Design a protein around this ligand. Structure first.
Ligand SMILES: Nc1ncnc2c1ncn2[C@@H]1O[C@@H]2COP(=O)(O)O[C@H]3[C@@H](O)[C@H](n4cnc5c(N)ncnc54)O[C@@H]3COP(=O)(O)O[C@H]2[C@H]1O
Ligand SMILES: Nc1ncnc2c1ncn2[C@@H]1O[C@@H]2COP(=O)(O)O[C@H]3[C@@H](O)[C@H](n4cnc5c(N)ncnc54)O[C@@H]3COP(=O)(O)O[C@H]2[C@H]1O
Lengths: 180, 181
């Protein structure tokens, strides 16, 4: 009865499989990013425990100190899924202040299928309670990890960032960025 | 433990919930569509048994008689999911020849999460065999109906079209189109 299992597979085959092994090559297409130092070429997938987000990350409730700042989008990646439709995959680059030091540059994204988990818990409580939802998050997380790590082309090109709605996303990002 | 179960929920909350109760109102935004007769304002969701499609529907392997023809896109519906990003939901209108009679007009779409089922069966056979895939289709289908039918705003605004890769999608569409109220 685990909805998260099918949510992870879709995320991979319907998105990450295309965009993760070409991300680094796509970022370097722009001189500004090619020159930039302190730039991690890995996609940071934000996974809030409450599966919720309602606004842009700069000056967000997750960024009280106003450290995160939108810098711009990457080069669009042309791809067709099923041959039925042609899309342009692009990502957002954010600038994270590191105090007096040169600010960091990274690619952050939310796990869009997590909204489906939240939406369920609010629209159909008889199918998913706040407790089950919290469990499905863990399920989604671990299952996603397995899928990704089972792909050589995607290994080392991503990072799963799990945090609580109280934690400072800026303080969490840096702790990861340096360890990268 | 059904991958199809989670595939249906995402389809609804991440798409159909937004686009289905506003589809008819969106179609009438174009004069050409307001005038057009023999036009069903319901979204026809194509569900091939093999979870596969590789090209445009006009002149496709599902349309040997070459009756289906792209007519144009509907008016885009601006909507935000999570408020983080703004998208434009639009759909494709197709013209289905009905012999000597006036051709039909409808909105057909594929169930994009079905590709994930196919992709699995080819990339990870040890997780989904060709047989399980066929079973997950039924699961996805039956579950999807329930979710939709459980929403009053979406009722009567959709239709599930199930067919085999051998059947003529044009011959299948009409059989549904005519039977539609
Ligand atoms: N489920 C989702 N989660 C997170 N972000 C999403 C999203 N769906 C769309 N977006 C973002 O919104 C952009 C424009 O969406 P739009 O729906 O108006 O126009 C879309 C849409 O009509 C179609 N498209 C995108 N994803 C699709 C999908 N999974 N299935 C079917 N059509 C899709 O391709 C067009 C352009 O795609 P493009 O990626 O270059 O650009 C997309 C993408 O960046
Ligand atoms: N262009 C893009 N940019 C960013 N992320 C992308 C993306 N295309 C796909 N994804 C990711 O993969 C999932 C879509 O899986 P799938 O496309 O097979 O199945 C999708 C698709 O069938 C439908 N859907 C979502 N957005 C759509 C759109 N703009 N147009 C048409 N269908 C859409 O809803 C299903 C679940 O989508 P969900 O949003 O919950 O979650 C998305 C999203 O997490």
């Amino acid at each position: 009865s685990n909805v998260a299992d099918g949510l992870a597979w879709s995320y991979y085959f319907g998105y990450l499989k295309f965009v993760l092994p070409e991300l680094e090559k796509q970022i370097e297409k722009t001189s500004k990013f090619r020159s930039k130092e302190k730039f991690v070429k890995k996609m940071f997938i934000l996974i809030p425990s409450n599966c919720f987000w309602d606004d842009k990350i700069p000056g967000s409730d997750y960024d009280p100190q106003n450290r995160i700042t939108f810098e711009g989008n990457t080069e669009p990646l042309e791809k067709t899924r099923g041959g039925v439709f042609l899309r342009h995959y692009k990502h957002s680059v954010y600038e994270i202040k590191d105090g007096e030091n040169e600010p960091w540059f990274c690619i952050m994204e939310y796990a869009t299928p997590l909204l489906t988990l939240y939406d369920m818990s609010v629209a159909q409580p008889g199918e998913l309670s706040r407790e089950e939802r919290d469990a499905q998050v863990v399920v989604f997380l671990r299952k996603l990890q397995d899928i990704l790590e089972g792909d050589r082309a995607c290994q080392g090109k991503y990072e799963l960032v799990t945090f609580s709605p109280d934690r400072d996303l800026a303080d969490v990002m840096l702790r990861k960025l340096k360890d990268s």
